[PDB]
């Protein structure tokens, strides 16, 4: 009944983009957005690994963005954003300095029942448009209201303009744009007064029109000027031509118009489909046969427009200008094709960003060729797990032999991402699994270091409780017994000084210098007590004893030699831990490398000193609490502190600290605060986690540089994680849960081992390990993107032979039309003009992908008929009397022929087996091959397929059959009559759960003694189901349903309840609203959680979520927290988390919402609060923070799969 939603992978895929002064008026910024998440970019020119987009800020929302614009307000130092959320919500946000968050300036709530005009089912999205001059801003609420925001507080009170109360009775708004010049804000509006449909054009030829309303901000009056009424019927978006020419260009599907107030209407036709469907005067464009129906465009300078068509093809329109700035003709050219975009923005002049949902959103660069013709090259691309259609769970092929006897199953997910030309597969895999190439058994030793001796690592320095081991590395690693190092006792640190020219180890008595094996000299160090840890800079070595005494050593070139320099440090309290840091891309400017020291004291004060001197530069007075933003001012116990620079050329520093079995890490951002002379111009911002530290010093925070190119920090402990920042600048935390807890870590570059690492097992085992090279660790999950260049529909892992069967599709031009004369089919060849685009016919094929190398297996491809479309593919466990069990595990495909609505659609069931045969010499992958057993036409379209105890269950038409696989044929056993179109089925233990497109789910049941199939229960309410799952509890079995209104809901079959009939009605017991559509569903058991399963799913906007079932008592301790987190915390864009996660029925029926799912991304903000603020929310709901953290962190431990 009770559950918790949790988000595993963020949504990838962009819908919105712009180019605005987000941080400051000095530079512009690419601010892109998508499904409920906002990304802000910079553009690096001198990037190591050529231009590259660098992430500057990432922002998450409790609501899906429906439009986005920007305007620079009067007296503002930045460029505010105008976000727009579903059913008439506006929010004006700026970037906030000081902190590093967003700041809401204005909130606008325009959803009242008198504005909906009686229409409950809203279709029209709110559309924010702003002025080119910044005078006002307009939102199209509900398609019949214009909200006008006046500009100069920075805002004037808004006023709603009724669209249908104007002249010309607008009533169906297509697109609306503000125009240039025209002294007052002028708003052009495309509309249709008498709407028609393409398909009914013989009685309504061309009905589109234009109103250029002129807004008076003060007087609140607005007259209609410059109306046209004879535009073609299929007019999509309009675009405002800039100021030196002025006017508007209007995209239609088959034509392109330039319209201006004084100029006569000019427009050309793009293909010969405006012959009998358009009476507007259109000329014929020369050498151009395309269409503009779903096309994005932007203006480069003035008179040049770049258009991204469907198919991804890029054209550049040139407005041929006369002497009086009047557009005379058009000019097209076919430039290089690109991704199927959803957005289009010019950056710095010479660049185009191309946002896309389906495909990798990439940045371009245009130069002129030597009229002007441009050439486009690709600079950077952003990785995109696309519109996840179907997704199968499988086992990877390269698990190392040391990790084979692990108790938990080792598995990954393969996702059908993208569409069309950008169709692909995505091999997602959450945790990092190393390749142990050489293991050891070295007990007793706990710490470890690798130094560079004459960039390969030369030595391996192992510290024991009484001695110290040395390993000479090279062609074959071998333990060293000669002089040099101190092996009579332990070592607390061992690293390089200078620039990889020396080796410095620290004993608890002193410090030795080393040119490799040869010891240079030795400096004993009493320093009160024995040395507990040391940190290293390039000339600096800073020592800390057990009683807080700090000394510093410095290289002086004499030949080099460490020199004692005692620091002047006013010890009002004892120093607990230390850290050193150098600048290589300096934001530590404090009003060429620069060295810095970090020093945590026992009173809770954190101090940064500029390291050549010892002056105090930065001071946080209450540090171990875990505040969100660290601000200078000049307990839980702080264990370990590490400052590290990560990214392109060591750009951005991070602060990683350890406070009472809790990891809390910080970013760093510049901040010019005029409140002193000698202070750092930086502040630190806490960033969220999924990592807990819940089970003479061992460092957990161990910085690595260049392990497989990637640089970052490995965080040791009971739950080891990889911290990674590449040149993207995006923070990446990847777990490593195999091989248990990890005690120590070191990078290790050798000959027999490539760029790689080296770590201790908890059982005392040294492991030479290399990261596996087929994944990309720059994405939020480690993923390999597999380009298919065709739309992947279904994927199914076949357990025998260990392969994937992928259903693909490519677009071919259609050439025939099926007819029906009563007895047989007749085909009419489409014979048209030469200036004619063809409709796209889809031809399907079934691939066979191998997990070893992810290429397709050659000569293994089932190709279907001409008009035949796979509607489902699942791995089907049919029964057989051959193996030791009953079940076999074939692959069945349900497919049928789409030939229009006047031809009877029939289907075919395609049952396939993958059998290992002998491979052809020269190709190792050709050992696998399909064997089609069953291929027979059915009596109607095959729309869903499943298995019940070895019986193939199929949905042909308005019936659901249940077949039995014989030696060669299927025999029918049972059937029922069902709903309109069963497009999904699932099954558990002779209980079928079907799903209709329009009506609802309907569970079935099959007795095996009597060959009968029976409807047990169903839902009578109408519901547009996408796909179905089973919520599995200890003894409860829920029926998880995803919907068209982005809703998750859980039905149960409860005959004891009175609000149903007697076993004849399904009763929903949980309601929830994910922000995206869901087609895929997975189950796996978790890592009190004795017999439950986790219903994983992948959203259709590119994310992955969870639903973890819980007890009733654990639900209600956290529901008291969720209501406290909703009200008592500020949210981005003023959005309400309760209002976003409630059910979104766009009707009214008798079904009051049963909310039994927690918001685990709202509950994830309780982990983000400081421990002073963490206890205030516990005292107000009558609990302690130890009880809540034993509930929020246990939902992260059992949900650490993949």
């Amino acid at each position: 009944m009770y559950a918790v939603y949790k988000q595993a992978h963020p949504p990838t895929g962009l819908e919105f983009s712009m180019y605005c002064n987000f941080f400051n008026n000095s530079e512009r910024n690419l601010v892109v957005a998508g499904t409920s998440q906002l990304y802000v970019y910079r553009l690096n020119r001198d990037a190591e690994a050529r231009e590259k987009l660098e992430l500057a800020a990432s922002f998450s929302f409790f609501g899906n963005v429906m439009s986005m614009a920007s305007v620079q307000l009067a007296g503002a130092k930045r460029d505010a954003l105008l976000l727009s959320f579903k059913d008439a919500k506006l929010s004006v946000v700026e970037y906030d300095p000081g902190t590093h968050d967003l700041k809401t300036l204005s909130l606008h709530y325009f959803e009242e029942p008198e504005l909906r005009d009686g229409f409950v089912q809203n279709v029209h999205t709110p559309r924010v448009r702003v002025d080119p001059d910044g005078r006002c801003a307009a939102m199209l609420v509900y398609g019949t209201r214009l909200v006008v925001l006046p500009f100069r507080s920075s805002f004037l009170p808004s006023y709603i303009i009724d669209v249908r109360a104007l002249d010309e009775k607008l009533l169906n708004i297509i697109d609306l744009q503000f125009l240039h010049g025209y002294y007052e804000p002028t708003l052009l509006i495309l509309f249709e007064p008498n709407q028609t449909w393409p398909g009914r054009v013989a009685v309504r030829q061309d009905t589109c029109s234009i109103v250029a309303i002129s807004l008076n901000i003060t007087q609140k009056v607005h007259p209609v000027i410059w109306s046209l009424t004879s535009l073609p019927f299929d007019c999509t978006q309009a675009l405002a031509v800039p100021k030196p020419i002025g006017g508007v260009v209007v995209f239609a599907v088959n034509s392109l118009l330039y319209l201006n107030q004084s100029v006569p209407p000019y427009g050309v036709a793009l293909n010969s489909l405006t012959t009998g469907t358009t009476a507007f005067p259109l000329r014929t464009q020369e050498g151009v046969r395309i269409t503009l129906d779903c096309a994005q465009a932007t203006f480069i300078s003035y008179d040049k427009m770049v258009i991204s068509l469907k198919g991804g093809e890029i054209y550049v329109l040139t407005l041929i200008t006369d002497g009086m700035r009047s557009v005379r003709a058009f000019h097209f050219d076919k430039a290089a094709a690109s991704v199927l975009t959803t957005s289009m923005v010019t950056m710095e002049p010479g660049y185009l960003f191309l946002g896309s949902r389906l495909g990798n959103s990439l940045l371009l660069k245009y130069t002129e060729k030597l009229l002007a013709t441009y050439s486009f090259e690709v600079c950077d691309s952003i990785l995109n797990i696309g519109p996840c259609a179907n997704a199968a769970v499988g086992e990877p092929a390269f698990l190392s032999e040391e990790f084979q006897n692990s108790p938990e199953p080792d598995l990954e997910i393969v996702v059908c991402s993208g569409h069309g030309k950008n169709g692909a597969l995505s091999v997602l895999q959450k945790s990092i699994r190393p390749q142990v190439v050489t293991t050891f058994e070295l007990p007793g030793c706990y710490d470890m270091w690798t130094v560079i001796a004459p960039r390969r690592h030369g030595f391996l320095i192992l510290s024991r409780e009484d001695s110290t081991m040395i390993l000479q590395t090279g062609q074959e690693i071998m333990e060293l017994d000669t002089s040099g190092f101190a092996t009579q006792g332990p070592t607390v640190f061992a690293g390089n000084i200078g620039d990889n020219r020396y080796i410095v180890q620290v004993s608890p008595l002193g410090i030795r210098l080393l040119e490799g094996v040869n010891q240079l000299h030795f400096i004993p160090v009493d320093l009160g007590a024995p040395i507990v840890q040391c940190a290293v800079a390039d000339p600096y070595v800073v020592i800390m004893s057990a009683e807080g005494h700090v000394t510093m050593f410095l290289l002086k070139s004499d030949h080099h030699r460490l020199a004692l320099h005692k620091p002047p440090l006013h010890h009002q309290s004892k120093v607990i831990t230390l850290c050193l840091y150098r600048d290589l891309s300096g934001m530590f400017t404090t009003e060429e490398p620069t060295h810095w020291c970090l020093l945590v004291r026992e009173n809770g004060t954190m101090e940064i000193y500029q390291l050549p001197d010892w002056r105090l530069v930065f001071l946080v007075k209450n540090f171990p609490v875990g505040q969100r933003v660290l601000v200078d001012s000049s307990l839980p116990l702080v264990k370990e502190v590490l400052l590290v620079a990560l990214g392109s050329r060591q750009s951005r520093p991070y602060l990683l600290v350890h406070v009472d079995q809790e990891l809390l890490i910080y970013e760093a951002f510049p901040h010019d605060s005029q409140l002193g002379q000698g202070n750092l111009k930086v502040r630190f911002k806490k960033v969220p986690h999924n990592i807990n530290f819940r089970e003479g010093r061992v460092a957990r925070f161990r910085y690595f540089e260049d392990i497989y190119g990637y640089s970052g920090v490995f965080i040791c402990g009971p739950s080891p994680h990889w911290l990674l920042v590449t040149g993207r600048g995006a923070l990446r935390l990847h777990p490593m849960a195999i091989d248990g807890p990890v005690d120590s870590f070191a990078p290790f570059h050798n000959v027999n081992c490539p760029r790689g690492f080296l770590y201790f097992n908890r059982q005392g085992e040294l492991r030479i390990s290399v990261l596996p090279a087929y994944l990309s660790y720059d994405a939020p999950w480690p993923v390999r993107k597999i380009p298919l260049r065709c739309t992947a529909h279904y994927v199914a892992y076949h357990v025998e032979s260990k392969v994937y069967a992928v259903a693909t599709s490519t677009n071919t031009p259609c050439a025939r039309i099926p007819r029906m004369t009563g007895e047989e089919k007749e085909f009419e060849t489409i014979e048209r003009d030469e200036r004619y685009i063809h409709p796209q016919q889809e031809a399907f094929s079934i691939q066979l992908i191998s997990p070893v190398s992810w290429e397709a297996i050659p000569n293994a491809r089932i190709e279907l008929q001409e008009w035949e479309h796979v509607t489902c593919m699942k791995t089907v466990s049919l029964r057989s009397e051959e193996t030791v069990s009953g079940l076999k595990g074939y692959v069945a495909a349900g497919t049928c022929l789409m030939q229009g609505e006047e031809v009877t659609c029939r289907g075919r069931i395609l049952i396939m087996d993958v059998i290992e045969v002998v491979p052809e010499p020269g190709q190792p992958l050709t050992k696998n091959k399909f064997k089609v057993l069953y291929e027979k036409e059915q009596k109607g379209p095959v729309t869903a397929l499943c298995h019940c105890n070895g019986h193939l269950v199929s949905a042909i038409g308005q019936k659901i059959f249940l077949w039995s696989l014989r030696a060669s044929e299927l025999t029918g056993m049972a059937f029922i009559d069902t709903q309109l179109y069963i497009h999904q089925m699932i099954s558990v233990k002779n209980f079928i759960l079907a799903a209709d497109v329009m009506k609802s789910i309907s569970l079935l049941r099959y007795q095996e003694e009597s060959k009968t199939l029976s409807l047990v229960s169903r839902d009578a309410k109408p519901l547009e189901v996408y796909s179905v799952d089973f919520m599995v509890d200890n003894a409860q079995l829920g029926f998880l349903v995803s919907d068209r209104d982005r809703n998750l809901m859980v039905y149960m079959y409860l005959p004891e309840a009175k609000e149903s009939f007697g076993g004849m009605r399904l009763l929903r017991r949980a309601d929830f609203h994910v922000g995206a559509h869901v087609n895929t569903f997975w189950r796996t058991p978790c890592r009190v959680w004795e017999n439950k399963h986790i219903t994983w799913f992948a959203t259709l906007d590119g994310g992955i979520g969870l639903l973890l079932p819980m007890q009733e008592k654990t639900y209600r301790r956290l529901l008291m927290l969720q209501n406290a987190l909703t009200t008592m915390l500020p949210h981005h864009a003023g959005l309400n988390p309760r209002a976003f996660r409630m059910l979104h029925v766009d009707r009214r029926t008798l079904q009051n919402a049963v909310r039994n799912v927690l918001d685990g991304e709202l509950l994830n903000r309780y982990l983000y609060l400081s421990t002073m603020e963490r206890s205030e929310l516990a005292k107000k709901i009558g609990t302690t923070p130890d009880i809540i953290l034993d509930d929020l962190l246990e939902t992260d431990r059992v949900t650490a799969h993949f």
Binding site: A796, L1037, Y1053, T1084
Partner: protein, 60 residues
């Protein structure tokens, strides 16, 4: 795939318990009904079926 990992053969669900002893199946009104397409009841073959003739399930 979904049964090697998430095996549910060792779980006795309340769905499976509520369909064996029928757990509160109401008697069907209007006794001239057909119910051709419903479940077959195991109570008629083994034990006293009870509401014979006015049972929602068929009788073999």
């Amino acid at each position: 795939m979904q049964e090697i990992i998430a095996s549910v053969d060792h779980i006795k669900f309340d769905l499976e318990i509520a369909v064996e002893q029928q757990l509160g199946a109401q008697p069907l009104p209007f006794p001239g009904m057909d119910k051709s397409g419903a479940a077959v009841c195991e109570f008629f073959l083994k034990a006293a079926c009870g509401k014979g003739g006015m049972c929602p399930f068929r009788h073999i």
